[PDB]
Design an enzyme around this catalytic site. Structure first.
Site, PDB file in Angstrom:
ATOM      1  N   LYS A 128     -15.081  -8.805 -13.713  1.00 55.63           N
ATOM      2  CA  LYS A 128     -15.705  -7.828 -14.377  1.00 55.63           C
ATOM      3  C   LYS A 128     -14.644  -7.167 -15.297  1.00 55.63           C
ATOM      4  O   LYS A 128     -13.731  -6.736 -14.734  1.00 55.63           O
ATOM      5  CB  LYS A 128     -16.513  -6.891 -13.365  1.00 55.63           C
ATOM      6  CG  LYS A 128     -17.124  -5.360 -14.056  1.00 55.63           C
ATOM      7  CD  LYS A 128     -17.444  -4.780 -12.999  1.00 55.63           C
ATOM      8  CE  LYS A 128     -18.858  -4.914 -12.330  1.00 55.63           C
ATOM      9  NZ  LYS A 128     -19.099  -4.441 -11.249  1.00 55.63           N
ATOM     10  N   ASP A 169     -30.360   1.935  -4.591  1.00 58.62           N
ATOM     11  CA  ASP A 169     -31.557   1.224  -4.478  1.00 58.62           C
ATOM     12  C   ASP A 169     -31.095  -0.439  -4.442  1.00 58.62           C
ATOM     13  O   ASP A 169     -30.043  -0.909  -4.347  1.00 58.62           O
ATOM     14  CB  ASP A 169     -32.368   1.401  -5.767  1.00 58.62           C
ATOM     15  CG  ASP A 169     -31.273   1.064  -6.959  1.00 58.62           C
ATOM     16  OD1 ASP A 169     -30.649   0.208  -7.095  1.00 58.62           O
ATOM     17  OD2 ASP A 169     -31.700   2.078  -8.009  1.00 58.62           O
ATOM     18  N   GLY A 174     -19.287  -2.223 -16.517  1.00 59.91           N
ATOM     19  CA  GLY A 174     -18.697  -3.368 -17.209  1.00 59.91           C
ATOM     20  C   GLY A 174     -19.419  -4.571 -17.465  1.00 59.91           C
ATOM     21  O   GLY A 174     -20.485  -4.750 -16.905  1.00 59.91           O
ATOM     22  N   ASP A 175     -18.969  -5.558 -17.968  1.00 67.87           N
ATOM     23  CA  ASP A 175     -19.565  -6.897 -18.337  1.00 67.87           C
ATOM     24  C   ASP A 175     -18.806  -7.919 -17.714  1.00 67.87           C
ATOM     25  O   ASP A 175     -17.567  -8.086 -17.721  1.00 67.87           O
ATOM     26  CB  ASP A 175     -19.659  -7.104 -19.955  1.00 67.87           C
ATOM     27  CG  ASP A 175     -20.037  -5.745 -20.597  1.00 67.87           C
ATOM     28  OD1 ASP A 175     -20.749  -4.966 -20.158  1.00 67.87           O
ATOM     29  OD2 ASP A 175     -19.361  -5.573 -21.729  1.00 67.87           O
ATOM     30  N   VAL A 176     -19.515  -8.734 -16.790  1.00 70.58           N
ATOM     31  CA  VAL A 176     -18.924  -9.811 -16.175  1.00 70.58           C
ATOM     32  C   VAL A 176     -18.669 -11.036 -17.010  1.00 70.58           C
ATOM     33  O   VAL A 176     -19.572 -11.503 -17.610  1.00 70.58           O
ATOM     34  CB  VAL A 176     -19.444 -10.083 -14.758  1.00 70.58           C
ATOM     35  CG1 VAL A 176     -18.954 -11.323 -14.161  1.00 70.58           C
ATOM     36  CG2 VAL A 176     -19.669  -8.929 -13.926  1.00 70.58           C
ATOM     37  N   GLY A 201     -23.538 -12.058 -16.309  1.00 72.35           N
ATOM     38  CA  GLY A 201     -23.592 -11.007 -15.352  1.00 72.35           C
ATOM     39  C   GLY A 201     -23.344  -9.739 -16.312  1.00 72.35           C
ATOM     40  O   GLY A 201     -22.776  -9.584 -17.375  1.00 72.35           O
ATOM     41  N   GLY A 246     -22.876  -5.831 -15.511  1.00 72.76           N
ATOM     42  CA  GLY A 246     -22.841  -4.782 -14.508  1.00 72.76           C
ATOM     43  C   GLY A 246     -23.193  -3.260 -15.168  1.00 72.76           C
ATOM     44  O   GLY A 246     -23.332  -3.140 -16.280  1.00 72.76           O
TER      45      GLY A 246
END
Ligand SMILES: [Br-]
Ligand code: NA
Length: 243
Positions: free
Chosen positions: A32, A126, A15-17, A10, A12
């Site tokens: 996250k 979106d 942030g980074d999951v 992941g 994001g």
């Protein structure tokens, strides 16, 4: 903190999951981390805790449950339910186009998540297939990460509305035909959305009912006010387009 980091999966927006073991709560969760403390700035701080608050207010079942959020060690975190499955992006590559009822089933669930988001005042600009996670029995969640592109972008976004309805219809298109409605590079694609005649999905694959061209035409009609007002109405029309 109470957690112990694991496999980086992941990626994001802010942030980074990581997958993570909650050692108090004794379960494996998705976590996250708005890494590297970019929101020492209050403008990031308040924004990503504003929509974090709206996220955990959601009750729709195709939106990942938020367990918790706040600060530990300066770092702002969001703890959420861990989900298994593959990207719609991953499916399509590996499976080709989807049988239309399957495509519809998937579109229905995400449109549902999108509607809920809009309703709590957290409208998504979106949808990407890479934001669509298909679990066990074609159960799909709308997730806010990877592992934005022009392929799914309404024209009104390029200058000076809910644009997610437009995006979802491109996504539906792709599920049906195998490919996004407009090919080419960023320039030609951006142009295609503004101007190119909306494609007619039945003119590509054999087993796609006619009624769908109408759905897609409406769903990515040029003037925003010609499109469906909700993803729900999109879904409904899409569903009804199976003979
Ligand atoms: Br797959
Ligand atoms: Na919407």
């Amino acid at each position: 903190g109470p957690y112990r980091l694991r496999r980086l999966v992941g990626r994001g927006g802010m942030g980074d999951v990581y997958e993570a073991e909650d050692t108090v709560r004794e379960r494996i969760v998705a976590l996250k981390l708005m890494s590297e403390t970019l929101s020492s700035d209050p403008v990031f701080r308040t924004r990503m805790q504003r929509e974090a608050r709206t996220a955990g207010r959601l009750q729709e079942p195709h939106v990942v449950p938020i367990h918790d959020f706040g600060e530990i060690d300066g770092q702002l975190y969001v703890d959420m339910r861990l989900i298994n499955g593959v990207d719609l992006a991953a499916m399509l590559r590996r499976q080709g186009p989807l049988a239309p009822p399957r495509a519809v089933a998937i579109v229905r669930q995400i449109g549902s998540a999108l509607d809920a988001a809009h309703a709590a005042g957290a409208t998504h600009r979106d949808v990407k297939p890479e934001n669509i996670l298909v679990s066990a029995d074609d159960f799909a969640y709308l997730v806010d990460f990877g592992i934005g592109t022009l392929y799914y972008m309404a024209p009104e976004r390029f200058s000076e509305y809910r644009a997610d309805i437009y995006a979802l219809t491109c996504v539906l298109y792709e599920c049906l035909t195998g490919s996004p409605p407009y090919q080419g590079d960023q320039l030609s694609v951006m142009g295609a959305h503004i101007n190119q005649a909306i494609p007619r999905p039945s003119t590509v694959r054999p087993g796609i009912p006619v009624a769908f061209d109408a759905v897609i035409a409406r769903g990515m009609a040029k003037n925003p006010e010609d499109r469906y007002v909700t993803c729900g109405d999109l879904s409904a029309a899409a569903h009804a387009a199976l003979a």
